Amino acid sequence: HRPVEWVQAVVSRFDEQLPIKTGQQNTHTKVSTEHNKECLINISKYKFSLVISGLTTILKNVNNMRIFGEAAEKNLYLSQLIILDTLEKCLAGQPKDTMRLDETMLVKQLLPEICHFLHTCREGNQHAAELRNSASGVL
């Protein structure tokens, strides 16, 4: 009962430390905010379905976000970079359960958002280069 609500806190704290989201200087030299990731990665091994689904919505929200300015673009670029890198580690980290019954998330939630980057994405000559490189490893 409670522990499910404990995981939400670890996930929820993840959103509020994405650069595009107000930084609020909670990084505490990034040691505090980095530790949270390691927990989020570790929890996925036993609640894979829950964690992955939560991550997708965080990515989906970031995509449907409009911001203008040199600061604006840089924040979102670094924002999506962390999500993808974390997301790949969860997949790789997960033991070879080889459970092929994840269709629900893949068909609708996940594939459309990963596929979006693979397009040319000519917004940034240097940024889009990394996103495709990072996203492809996920796929």
């Binding site: 009962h1 409670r2 522990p3 609500e5 404990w6 995981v7 806190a9 670890v10 929820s12 704290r13 909670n26 505490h28 040691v31 505090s32 530790h35 390691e38 927990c39 570790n42 929890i43 036993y46 609640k47």
Partner: protein, 473 residues
Amino acid sequence: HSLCTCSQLHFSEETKQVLRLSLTEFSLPKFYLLFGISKVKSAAVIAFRSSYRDRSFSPGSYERETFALTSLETVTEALLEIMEACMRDIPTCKWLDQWTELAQRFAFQYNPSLQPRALVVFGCISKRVSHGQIKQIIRILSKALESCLKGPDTYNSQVLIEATVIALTKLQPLLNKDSPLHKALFWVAVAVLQLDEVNLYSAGTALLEQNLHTLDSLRIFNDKSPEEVFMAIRNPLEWHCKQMDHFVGLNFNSNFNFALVGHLLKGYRHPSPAIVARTVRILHTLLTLVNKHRNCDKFEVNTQSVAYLAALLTVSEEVRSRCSLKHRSNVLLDEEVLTDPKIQALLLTVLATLVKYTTDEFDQRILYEYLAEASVVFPKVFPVVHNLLDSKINTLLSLCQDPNLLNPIHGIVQSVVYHEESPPQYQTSYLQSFGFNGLWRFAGPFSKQTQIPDYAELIVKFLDALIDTYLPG
């Protein structure tokens, strides 16, 4: 001063040195506070007024400080020190026997303005007490409680209780060496801690602490363990006792050591930093007695001696080092000896409770490291510690920014999910089944809305039976 400069009396040169030190002591800022004239540079000036012939005095500032019956003991024993020095020289003096008689007359007579002060003094000076006297004192406490709940005037009779307890703390070391009440005054102390008032709690420990010290000097714990002695004398009046345990939410038949510790844990919430160290000493003295019964080096871990080590964990360094967490001598939480489901459900509630109200970095660090390690070594019983840990961890996860304190909490979350996927064998209400449903409640802070918990209607009957059984007449 008149004593030091009197010719009728012939004090040797030894005595006169005692007096002169007393003369200096009374003029220190310590005694200005006791008399209640602190913030007064010199007493003489205030006592006299220059323009006392021309105009009448003009009092003001009706705001008036309070008095504490503990202050009266300190003064009342300073005077008693002076008087005895004199009686050494004066042969066949009658001073002390005349003063006692005056106190004994107001002590046992109803007067709500003089009775409390005449009890704190009757005991501090008296040299002999008989069974007939003790019964009256303990029956002034029984009527004091009854008035409190009946009427709306509380503070009036909340000092006649604190004064009865302070007297008993002084009159016991004079009792006969073979009297039952030497042991039945362990339940008076316990029945007073249950009233949830900072003064009543403070006075209750002082009776408890000396109750152990006296029984040792009588060599009563030589061949028996605390549980055996106090639980043997409670048997004749078990019927009234049983009902109290139901409402306070602790049981003494199920597990003695834990019930006794349960009450003392509230001491950690006392505003005065002098009552905090007194409850720690009472724990050591209890720890050194249970192990001595088993000849176990005073720091061995067993079923009996595990409750007092969780309480001493965060205050006593020798306890922490000699009982160390395995995943950094023997290590607390051993599953070889702590192989009983009950004896390991309670030991977790004590640890969870100590952090629910604590607010200190050094304490939260030490207590959580023992809770992570508990999460793994005791997977099955740990789900009985969620609601206690539920709220505070949830806040810590969101806002905490300390690597030292943020590590163990994460270890707790990971363990919970891992050992999930099974139908909970033990629910949160596992403790209410066998009595200790109130253990976490009894250690809360002292209520600002001072009121008798209203289950004092039973403490009266318990006391009444206690008199009837051991003081027939």
